[PDB]
């Protein structure tokens, strides 16, 4: 009942949403957008099964692009330390089999890889860009169909990989080139970039007003947030029990905002899309559901659609 009352005093607070984001990764300074994304990943979308049997992904996939100078791996260390049912792995150290699932003797049988172990969970892939394309393309099924399917050595299976993937890619050459598109800064391509719900780029050029307080924070951390980790986890567990619904106004407004992103993504005389596929409309649905969970309301207001549209625009204004 003490925990019940802490939950009540948390949901009573009208602006708890800010307090949640500032409770993400408290040992790392700044980068509010990334922290907001990690909150809206531990709060997933609502997974759905259609009348035709076709599934819709609930999990949210996030990429954190950053130079090896940036405090980037801190987010992976945090969420794997915090979130239940999660794993850490390194991009080149893990193969395609090592990532989805391998086939081993004991007979022939299946050995669970990282994306199997993080089912109904979070998989954190550090140094993602160094992963070979052969290793990257293996996860295209687990990314979106939420499964791994195998046909090898007389063992045939399809395996559940309902997993929110968190990738920490470096830019090509380490340095992020601000003159180039997000497409140009990575060795990824549209099949896998469309599978991520959103990309964050986090940059660390010198700025004395920032660098002074950032340096001070590093020494403060060596001991010269509003909620504890326990309280945040309890809230996340409670918020995940909510299953928000799109209000009628939100549906039409979301169609308009998708048409805006879709229009702005068009390139070439063919009006080819690149970043905004149909997958990104569904990404906005997932993100607004996660936002509604963050606010513990069973109905999605158009303000959440506006926030989801702006969250995707953190990537779309960089092309």
């Amino acid at each position: 009942s003490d925990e019940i009352n802490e939950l009540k005093e948390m949901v009573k607070d009208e602006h708890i949403y800010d307090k949640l984001v500032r409770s993400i990764a408290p040992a790392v300074f700044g980068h509010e957008a990334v922290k907001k994304g990690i909150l809206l990943q531990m709060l997933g979308g609502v997974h759905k099964s259609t009348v035709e049997g076709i599934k819709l992904r609930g999990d949210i996939n996030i990429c954190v692009v950053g130079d090896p100078s940036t405090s980037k791996s801190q987010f992976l260390k945090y969420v794997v330390g915090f979130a239940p049912r999660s794993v850490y792995t390194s991009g080149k150290a893990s193969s395609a089999a090592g990532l989805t699932a391998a086939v081993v003797r004991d007979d022939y049988t299946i050995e669970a890889g990282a994306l199997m172990l993080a089912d109904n969970g979070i998989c954190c892939i550090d140094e993602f860009d160094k992963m070979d394309i052969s290793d990257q393309v293996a996860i295209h099924e687990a990314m979106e169909q939420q499964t791994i399917s195998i046909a090898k050595a007389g063992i045939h299976a399809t395996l559940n990989a309902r997993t929110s993937i968190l990738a920490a890619a470096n830019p090509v050459g380490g340095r992020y080139n601000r003159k180039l598109s997000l497409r140009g800064n990575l060795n990824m391509t549209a099949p896998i970039m469309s599978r991520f719900d959103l990309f964050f780029v986090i940059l660390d050029d010198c700025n004395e007003k920032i660098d002074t307080e950032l340096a001070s924070h590093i020494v403060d951390l060596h001991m010269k947030p509003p909620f504890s980790a326990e309280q945040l986890r309890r809230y996340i567990k409670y918020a995940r029990t909510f299953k928000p619904i799109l209000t009628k106004e939100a549906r039409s407004y979301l169609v308009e905002k998708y048409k805006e992103l879709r229009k702005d993504d068009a390139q070439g005389f063919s009006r080819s899309s690149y970043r905004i596929t149909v997958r990104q409309l569904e990404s906005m649905i997932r993100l607004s559901e996660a936002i509604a969970r963050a606010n513990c309301v069973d109905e999605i207001t158009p303000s959440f659609i506006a926030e989801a549209y702006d969250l995707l625009r953190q990537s779309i204004i960089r092309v």
Binding site: G53, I54, E141, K152, A153, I155
Partner: protein
């Protein structure tokens, strides 16, 4: 089945019913319908056997429901198997 088969629009109602929660792509739904019903396998006096199965390739851009169409067909076909990309070895596909 005998009743609904008489309908003048039955091919189109079947095709529209293929993967009903996927918008558009009536060409894909047609190709899937043709594949899923199949042709007639034939054998000419036992001296020459001919394929009845229809093979279909869904080639195209990301986020266009191709994988979802295949998962639907796995749902709908009376004997089905599904194997993505790097998950399929040569002997794991034919025999070992």
């Amino acid at each position: 089945f005998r009743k609904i088969s008489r309908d003048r629009g039955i091919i189109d109602k079947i095709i529209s019913s293929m993967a009903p929660s996927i918008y558009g792509h009536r060409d894909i739904k047609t190709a899937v319908a043709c594949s899923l019903f199949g042709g007639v396998p034939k054998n000419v006096n036992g001296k020459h056997s001919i394929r009845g199965d229809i093979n279909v390739l869904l080639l195209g851009d990301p986020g266009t429901a191709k994988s979802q169409i295949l998962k639907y067909v796995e749902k709908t076909a009376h004997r089905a198997v599904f194997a993505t990309g790097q998950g399929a070895s040569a002997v794991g596909l034919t025999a070992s």
